[PDB]
Amino acid sequence: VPRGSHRILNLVKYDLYSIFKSPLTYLAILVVSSLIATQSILMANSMDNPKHIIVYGSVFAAAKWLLLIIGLMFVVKTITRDFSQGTIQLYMSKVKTRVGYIISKTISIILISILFALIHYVILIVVQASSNGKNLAFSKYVDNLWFFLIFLLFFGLFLFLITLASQKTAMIFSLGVFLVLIVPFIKPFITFIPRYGEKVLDAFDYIPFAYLTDKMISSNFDFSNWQWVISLGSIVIFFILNILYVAKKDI
Amino acid sequence: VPRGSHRILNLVKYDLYSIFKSPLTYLAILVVSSLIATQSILMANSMDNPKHIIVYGSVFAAAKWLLLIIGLMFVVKTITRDFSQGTIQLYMSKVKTRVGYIISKTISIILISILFALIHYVILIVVQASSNGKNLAFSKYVDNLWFFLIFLLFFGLFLFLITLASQKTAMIFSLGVFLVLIVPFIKPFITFIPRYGEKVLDAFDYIPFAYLTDKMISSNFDFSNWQWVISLGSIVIFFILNILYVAKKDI
Amino acid sequence: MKLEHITKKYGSNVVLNDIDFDFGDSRIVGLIGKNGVGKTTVMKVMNGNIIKFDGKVDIDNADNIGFLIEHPKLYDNKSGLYNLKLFAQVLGKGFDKAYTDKIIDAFGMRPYIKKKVKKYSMGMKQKLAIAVSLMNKPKFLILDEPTNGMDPDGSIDVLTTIKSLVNELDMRILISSHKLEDIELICDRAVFLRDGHFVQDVNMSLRDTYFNINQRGDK
Amino acid sequence: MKLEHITKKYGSNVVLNDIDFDFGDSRIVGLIGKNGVGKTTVMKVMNGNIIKFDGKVDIDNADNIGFLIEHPKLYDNKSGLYNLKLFAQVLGKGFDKAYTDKIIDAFGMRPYIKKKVKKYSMGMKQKLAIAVSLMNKPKFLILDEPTNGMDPDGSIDVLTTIKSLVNELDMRILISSHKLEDIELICDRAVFLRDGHFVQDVNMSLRDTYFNINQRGDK
């Protein structure tokens, strides 16, 4: 009934509300804005002594990288808040509520992703207003939203399941960071070394951790039919597992 | 008096004791061993169809990377254990004890670093026993110890100070990982882009975070006189700050 | 809220063993026993924080259950008032300002309700936690040592307030608690739990009853 | 252990105000007051967990102080026995097996001492925590509601045990606690704290004394 739905949404509202009140959020936004403005101002308009013309695509990709990381950390905090304060015990009292808890968090993750995508959009629009160059297609920004939604929801639900499996929070933040910064590190470090190097590299296109992390610094994207399906399928199964698990795990 | 020293050491003994009992330690060791054996077996002895002759230096550097990360996480756990369980409140009751607490942890960090260096040594000796190639100098392994001691102590004390400053543990594990995997990521991503690119890159030689992280994947090292001094000086000041801070911070 | 044949063990340690429970038209049921007997365990089964109890827990899920188990659960960086509003909106039906105020002033937590929880004393946290549970305007209230950290006056006012509320709302209250003297203030029965099962059903000192039953464990 | 002119505030909230304290050749001093008065604060100042108290805390640092403040502090993934050994070696002089055993069996925690702390009940954790403090073989023992979660028998045996120990060891004990009835079992004086200062020094019910002093805050 709508009463159930209402209670679920009320929890969502509080998590988002918190994001918009903590000064930390505001700080993080200012940091991103500063870094982007810095790149634009310092060299995009000056390195080759151009007549102040820049590549928004370079800015775009950098902004995405930063916001996806900050976003993922916001997602992790959203996920771990109840384990941290121990308040989870007050929610998981019956199946209807336990399931609603997962639903609420899933919704919050989606809304966080939307927020970050909106920030990304705004930062880049300001850059476009500020200098010269051909503006990016609206549809490019839209596809960027899709990337954010998928990236963050995939990692969010994955980490959520782990959080519930272990009931630890320190290692969730650790994994969020670790996974993001390991793919781009390890690829060029050793992928080329084994006789299976090419095999391994090709394999990454079918592994969401690898391809979603790699695309975090791309100016654009185009998922292959398989790659698209695999990522979305992974999201669906994690969601399902979270439900099946929460329904059985003692708190 | 020796009684004071004894109590400090007893705390150290317990932290190390814990490391040697948890199955997680044993798992981590096996993982490193497996990865090294894997590289040796899969391609070092076969990629170019050599007569089973390998470069221990490639193995050496990889092993170092893995052990320094695992080591740093062991260090972070050693640091945050008392905040996590809240047991810190039972120690910080008077200055003599508060100071002893810092001393104990400093000693534990050093001993952890030694342990990891010993593991590194053993893994590589096994590799040398296993296949062909010119064995690495004993003195190279020794210098590698020095690298471990410095790397881990620098990060350990830095993170310790943060831990005490914020009284949070989730963000200590996060920083440990983040810092390690960010330097090698960011360098080639944007260092070359600004007109100050060369300036920035050169600057990294004087910034311990950058140069200590970068050398984690080197087969060897040679610190410049400045670089050597800067790192060691940084360790000393962190140690001092930890003492001054713990002596004043309410628990 | 009925329990039929509940059995629960941790490995070889049987805590509950074929234990039955109900409210025989009673409203306030006290639960008495020694530490290690399983009072919290029973409450968790009723709350539904356990799903491995090998038995039947009969709950009309249409109803709300409010509860407080072990140490209080609060969001530390938020105000007391914030927590009450949140839980009322989240676990409860909605935030009822008048209801909330009656509890705050009855408990006398008013002077610090707008301060952050991390700045609260243990006692203050418990007064708030009880209120948090009450904010669901539940029918079943399950409290694990609700006055454990309260001072003499706090305990009396809180317990008195709850008794008033069980008529305002059609409630059934289960209170597991030491301080038999507090149970004696607000009760109409008490059950004595020992060795995984109920031993006495005492309809209405409780202290004398308790010792008669449990003193021989250690003595 | 003397306190001279201790003053402590949190922002505008003055908790302690020119408060003095000593042991006038007494051994067991109870501390009584309402929740929010500052009993824990006083104890933290004495323990030395606070260094911003604007006053003089006179402690011969040659001596050991054992203590338990708020919820028990234990290493959760280790056994009870492990914690006792650790603290005896770490904060205490060394691990005294005979001493340890007397406490374990006197408290009656023996049946679960080898089990992991995370598997302990709240009551069990407190019995252990008291023992942990005692393991330092301290001279000054400071306990914040030491029997807060104990059952009727646990409380009596633990308190009795401590009183025996204050003669075995030359101890001075400060106990902040509700359950005036427990203070009345083991005490030779009690002090009543109100509005940041001591109001009565009662040398030796305490409940009647308490209400006479504090009831007017709320009533």
Ligand SMILES: Nc1ncnc2c1ncn2[C@@H]1O[C@H](COP(=O)(O)OP(=O)(O)OP(O)(O)=S)[C@@H](O)[C@H]1O
């Ligand atoms: N997570 C757990 N793992 C193992 N044993 C447990 C766990 N939780 C509780 N127990 C055991 O179950 C028994 C009863 O536990 P509780 O329900 O917490 O006790 P209780 O009746 O609430 O007692 P209190 O805490 O002193 S009021 C004890 O023997 C505990 O050691």
Ligand SMILES: Nc1ncnc2c1ncn2[C@@H]1O[C@H](COP(=O)(O)OP(=O)(O)OP(O)(O)=S)[C@@H](O)[C@H]1O
């Ligand atoms: N960290 C803190 N920040 C702000 N205020 C605090 C803090 N800790 C305690 N207080 C306040 O200090 C006053 C006394 O606190 P306590 O020493 O914890 O009380 P108490 O006498 O031990 O009471 P209990 O917990 O109910 S026995 C209260 O008004 C608290 O709100």
Ligand SMILES: [Mg+2]
């Ligand atoms: Mg309990």
Ligand SMILES: [Mg+2]
């Ligand atoms: Mg207190």
